[PDB]
Design a protein around this ligand. Structure first.
Ligand SMILES: C[C@@H]1O[C@@H](O)[C@@H](O)[C@H](O)[C@@H]1O
Ligand SMILES: C[C@@H]1O[C@@H](O)[C@@H](O)[C@H](O)[C@@H]1O
Ligand SMILES: [Cl-]
Ligand SMILES: [Cl-]
Ligand SMILES: [Cl-]
Ligand SMILES: [Cl-]
Ligand SMILES: [Cl-]
Lengths: 141, 139
């Protein structure tokens, strides 16, 4: 994009592209998991108004990360998994400058990790179908 | 300023920190069983410098960047090796080719695809082998 740093897409090539773009501020992220990651719902500030986007499928059970002020997403790790034929995220977690969350989901696979020594996660993108085939992030300082 | 991603690997060795370069020219990865070391050669504020990270061992494999060839990928495997935790395998992708991975000791893998941006620099820890490595990213 427009001076943007986009990192990954980890996962399979199934499903449909989704691209959140960068946010001014991520308010909350909400991961839906059972066996795998079903989806992610994101809520953020763009242009001064609140927006919420719904990625991946609609299944699974929510795990909500509510960023306090001064809390930033500075890590994301998971496991790329075969699952009933499709390659999707079997596990997904996140770290802020305060706590870790997850990983959510119960299907192991080939792991990925993204420690962000400097910067934060500013947005998301990836692939979505019945479940969360794949996920990447936007970065910024 | 910068966007630093990772340090994948162990906590032994001494830290290193190339900082971001203007352009990267070549990366050289010495490996045997594991990843012994990396040489980087790059331009920086009108100079040309080289740095060697980690040890003296291994057989080299060179990535020489062409006109408008960026590093847009790094990937390998964190490893326990006769004690120390080190890069056991390591490879890069340019926007034209994949290279490697070099080294022959699996373990727990990592992948950093860059969909938008480039690797402009390295940091990490090194000793006799390449204990840990991370990268600086830029648009
Ligand atoms: C109630 C449980 O909460 C977490 O442990 C999830 O990983 C499970 O999938 C389930 O939602
Ligand atoms: C390969 C997969 O096998 C089982 O997991 C089924 O329930 C799926 O629908 C698919 O058939
Ligand atoms: Cl140094
Ligand atoms: Cl470069
Ligand atoms: Cl040196
Ligand atoms: Cl570029
Ligand atoms: Cl060592």
């Amino acid at each position: 994009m427009n001076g943007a740093i986009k990192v990954g897409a980890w996962g399979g090539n199934g499903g449909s592209a989704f691209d959140m773009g960068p946010a001014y501020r991520i308010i909350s992220v909400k991961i839906f998991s059972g066996d795998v990651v079903d989806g992610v719902d994101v809520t953020f500030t763009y242009y001064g108004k609140t927006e919420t986007r719904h990625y991946g499928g609609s299944g699974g059970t929510p795990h909500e990360i509510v960023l306090q002020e001064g809390e930033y997403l500075v890590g994301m790790a998971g496991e790329v998994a075969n699952y009933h034929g499709a390659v999707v995220l079997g596990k997904l977690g996140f770290s802020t400058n305060k706590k870790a969350y997850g990983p959510f989901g119960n299907t192991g696979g080939t792991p990925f990790s993204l420690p962000i020594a400097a910067g934060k996660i500013s947005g998301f993108f990836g692939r979505g179908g019945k479940f969360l085939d794949a996920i990447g992030v936007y970065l910024e300082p």
